[PDB]
């Protein structure tokens, strides 16, 4: 009787912990517990996540330790705020985002204690710059398939927005477990304290970058255009011939002065414009 609009909100901070722990044990399958709060009959939100110590050698999520669970949970409450374990996350190095046989088996354990537990898989290698790749999942009852009645009782065009990955579909996707849409919560205090902080400098603006070395860099770059320009002449006559596709493929083994010359010019103009501009700006700021 799920609502196929779960929309598990994760965090602006729980994600960073998930990724950092995932990459730390990249060869293995680290596991942890999600500390979130159920809110609606339609949404489950996580707030914080804490890792569980690795049992040792072996790429598996075999079991959780009850005593460690209690000790940290009973310790976070007395300083932070109480939270209830809502799901567990384990990082798949590069396989993808799905649940294996062991992962399914460990999952029903959590569901037994809590009906709406959510399992999450984080991939720390596939995610590169703007894609994190999580795809939180949950199990489907075997009785339903035996009954044959389709689960999730779709009542909105919200869950069928992400095309399931073919790699995930090969495994028990929509057969032994169903994915739940995952979105994120972001606020200006979080964003402004991260975006306007990551790549910044204090006083590098008014620094003249080793004026002696600056012109030496210019001489080396310009001298490269002397030979580069000469090859440009030899690269214009032989062009504009038949089968330009033949010409296009003919530039797959030898440097093309058309692009190389422009690249050097681009760096040359910006380096001096900035370097020169700082000269006059400084001459007025300081005496």
| Binding-site residue positions | 90, 92, 103
187 sits near other proteins (criterion: CB under 8 A)? yes
CB atoms within 10 A of CB 275: 16
Q: Work out which of 6, 103, 123, 135 binds Zn ion, going by CB under 5 A.
A: 103
Stretch that binds other proteins, among 25-33, 70-78, 114-122, 148-156 (CB under 8 A): 148-156
Instruction: Return d(Cα 136, Cα 118) in angstroms, integer.
Output: 7
135 sits near Zn ion (criterion: CB under 5 A)? no
Q: State the binding string over 39-58 for other proteins (x if CB under 8 A, else -).
A: xxxxx---------------
2 sits near other proteins (criterion: CB under 8 A)? no
Q: How distant, in Å, are the alpha carbons of 96, 121, 229 from that of 180? A: 16, 12, 57
Q: Work out which of 129, 149, 200, 259 binds other proteins, going by CB under 8 A.
A: 149
DSSP 204-226: GGG----HHHHHHHHHHHHHHHH
Q: How distant, in Å, are the alpha carbons of 9, 233, 262 from that of 244? A: 52, 18, 22
Q: Which does 7 bind (CB under 5 to 8 A by kind): Zn ion, other proteins, none?
A: other proteins
266 sits near other proteins (criterion: CB under 8 A)? no
Residues 63-92 that bind Zn ion (CB under 5 A): 90
Instruction: Return d(Cα 35, Cα 60) in angstroms, integer.
Output: 22
Per-residue tokens: 148: 């044959």
C-beta of 30 vs 182, nearer to other proteins? 182
Ramachandran sector of residue 162 (left: φ over 0; alpha: ψ -120 to 50; beta: rest): beta
C-beta of 60 vs 126, nearer to other proteins? 126
Burial of 264 (0-12, 13-18, 19+ CB in 10 A): middle
Instruction: Return d(Cα 177, Cα 166) in angstroms, integer.
Output: 15
Number of residues that bind other proteins (CB under 8 A): 22
C-beta of 5 vs 119, nearer to Zn ion? 119
Number of residues that bind Zn ion (CB under 5 A): 3
Q: Work out which of 160, 216, 241, 258 binds other proteins, going by CB under 8 A.
A: 160
Per-residue tokens: 250: 């003919």
Which residues make up the interface to other proteins (CB under 8 A)? 1, 5, 7, 39-43, 148-150, 153-158, 160-161, 163, 187-188
């Amino acid at each position: 009787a799920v609502d196929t609009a779960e929309q598990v909100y994760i965090s602006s901070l729980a994600l960073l912990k998930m990724l950092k722990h995932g990459r730390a044990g990249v060869p293995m399958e680290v596991m942890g517990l999600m500390l979130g709060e159920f809110v609606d009959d339609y949404t489950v939100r996580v707030i914080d996540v804490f890792a569980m110590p690795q049992s040792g050698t072996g790429v598996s999520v075999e079991a959780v330790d009850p005593v460690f669970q209690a000790k940290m949970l009973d310790m976070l409450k007395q300083t932070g705020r109480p939270e209830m374990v809502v799901g567990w996350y384990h990082s798949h190095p590069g396989f993808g985002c799905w649940l294996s046989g062991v992962d399914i088996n460990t999952q029903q354990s959590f569901e037994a204690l809590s009906e709406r537990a959510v399992a999450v898989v984080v991939d720390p290698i596939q995610s590169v710059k703007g894609k994190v790749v999580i795809d939180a999942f949950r199990l489907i009852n075997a009785n339903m398939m035996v009954l044959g009645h389709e689960p999730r009782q779709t009542t909105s065009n919200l869950g069928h927005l992400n095309k399931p990955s073919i790699q995930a579909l090969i495994h028990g996707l929509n057969r032994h477990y169903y994915s739940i849409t995952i979105n994120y919560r972001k606020n200006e205090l979080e964003q402004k304290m991260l975006l306007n902080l990551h790549k910044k400098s204090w006083m590098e603006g008014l620094t003249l970058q080793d004026y002696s070395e600056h012109c030496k860099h210019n001489e080396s770059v310009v001298k490269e255009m002397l030979e580069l320009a000469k090859n440009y002449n030899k690269a214009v006559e032989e062009e504009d011939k038949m089968t330009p596709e033949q010409l296009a493929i003919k530039n797959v083994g030898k440097q093309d002065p058309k692009r190389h010359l422009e690249e050097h010019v681009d760096v040359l103009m910006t380096s001096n414009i900035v370097q020169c501009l700082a000269a006059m700006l400084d001459t007025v700021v300081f005496k």
